[PDB]
Amino acid sequence: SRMEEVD
Amino acid sequence: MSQFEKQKEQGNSLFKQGLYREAVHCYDQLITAQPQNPVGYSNKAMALIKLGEYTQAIQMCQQGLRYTSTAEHVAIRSKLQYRLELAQGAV
Ligand SMILES: [Cl-]
């Protein structure tokens, strides 16, 4: 996912 | 899905819903269940940042990095974003 997103 | 992955999807669903304290609480259960898995710390740090809880975020980042190996395929965008903050910090 993107830098601003969770995993 | 394992129980960890189910609890993690719930925290992530709360996070995507903009329910950050609620997500933090689920992420705490990830940390408790799997203390050497960086994902709980990383996810908890994002939810904290959304809440303006910067000090606890720093603590979660430092803790999660203790359980993270090298990452050898880092995206350029990631490096630009990290180096921007690193340098802003150092000024
Ligand atoms: Cl990356």
Author numbering:
A (entry chain Q): 0 to 6
B (entry chain A): 1 to 91
Reproduce passages from the article:
Tah1 binds the C-terminal conserved MEEVD motif of Hsp90, thus linking an eclectic set of client proteins to the R2TP complex for their assembly and regulation by Hsp90. The R2TP complex consists of the AAA+ ATPase Rvb1 and Rvb2 heterododecamer complex (RUVBL1 and RUVBL2 in humans), a tetratricopeptide (TPR)-containing protein (Tah1, or RPAP3 in humans and Spag/Spaghetti in Drosophila) and Pih1 (also known as NOP17). In yeast, Tah1 acts as the direct link between the R2TP complex and Hsp90 by binding the C-terminal conserved MEEVD peptide motif of the chaperone and the C-terminal region of Pih1. Rather than the normal complement of seven α-helices seen in other tetratricopeptide repeat (TPR) domains, Tah1 unusually consists of the first five only.
To address these questions, we have obtained a new crystal form of Tah1 in complex with the EDASRMEEVD peptide of Hsp90 that reveals a swap between α-helix 5 of two adjacently Hsp90-bound Tah1 molecules. The structure of a complex between the TPR domain of Tah1 and the Hsp90 peptide EDASRMEEVD (residues 1–7 of which, S1RMEEVD7, are the only residues visible in the structure) was solved by single-wavelength anomalous diffraction (see §2) and refined to 2 Å resolution. The residues forming this extended segment also provide additional interactions with the Hsp90 peptide, including main-chain hydrogen bonds between the Glu72 and Val74 residues of Tah1 and the first residue (Ser1) of the bound peptide. The Hsp90 peptide essentially adopts the same conformation as previously seen in Tah1 (monomeric) and AIP structures, including the important carboxylate-clamp interaction. Significantly, Gln81 not only makes a set of new interactions with the MEEVD peptide but also completes the hydrophobic pocket into which the methionine of the Hsp90 peptide binds. The metastable nature at the beginning of the fifth α-helix of Tah1 appears to be an inherent property of this domain and is probably essential for initiating the helix swap. It also appears from our analysis that it is very unlikely that the helix-swapped conformation was induced by a crystallo­graphic contact.
